């Protein structure tokens, strides 16, 4: 069956956006860093390692606003033991109606792919925001590219995208704009 249950009713009329975690909303690593926004303990073979996470600039405004405009869904190739705690700490407003991790992606030709057909939404009303064009090779027409992010504290790409999404949120068919 599909990955998502039916949209709950205030969301039925909304475009579903699939949003990626790593290098899109945050950048994490095992290398300590003093200014991590989050530190997450992750157990790998019985040893607890520390993951240090930085928030992309304007991520908070981004999610708050996207959370009103869309049925927002987290889709990541990372494992839940990492992504779930990050999503918990990052998503103060409940933008994310659902979360999907590595086991929900399709492993194909090397890559973990976000197969949008598997969501169970109408694809004319689906978008994927993802920094890696490999993630949506099955549906590149549903995509809003976004540059990879690592630590540039001058980044404004999440602020700067909101106007595009505001107008996207209104249309009947996303292909009408991304062709």
């Amino acid at each position: 069956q599909y990955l998502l249950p039916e949209a709950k009713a205030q969301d039925s009329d909304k475009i579903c956006v699939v949003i990626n975690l790593d290098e899109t909303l945050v950048h994490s690593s095992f290398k300590p860093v003093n200014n991590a926004d989050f530190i997450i303990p992750v157990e790998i073979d019985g040893v607890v390692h520390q993951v240090y996470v930085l928030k992309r600039p304007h991520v908070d405004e981004f999610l708050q606003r996207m959370g009103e405009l869309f049925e927002c869904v987290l889709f990541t190739a990372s494992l839940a033991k990492y992504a779930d705690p990050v999503a918990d700490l990052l998503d103060k407003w409940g933008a994310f109606r659902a979360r999907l991790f590595r086991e929900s992606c399709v492993f194909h030709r090397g890559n973990y792919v976000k197969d949008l057909s598997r969501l169970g939404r109408d694809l004319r009303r689906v978008l994927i925001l993802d920094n890696s064009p490999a993630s949506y090779v099955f549906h590149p027409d549903n995509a809003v590219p976004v540059a990879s992010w690592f630590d540039n504290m001058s980044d404004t790409e999440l602020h700067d995208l909101l106007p595009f999404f505001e107008q996207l949120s209104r249309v009947d068919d996303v292909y009408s704009v991304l062709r």
Binding site: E23, V42, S78, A83
Partner: peptide, 4 residues
Amino acid sequence: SPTX
């Protein structure tokens, strides 16, 4: 990795 557990990350992406």
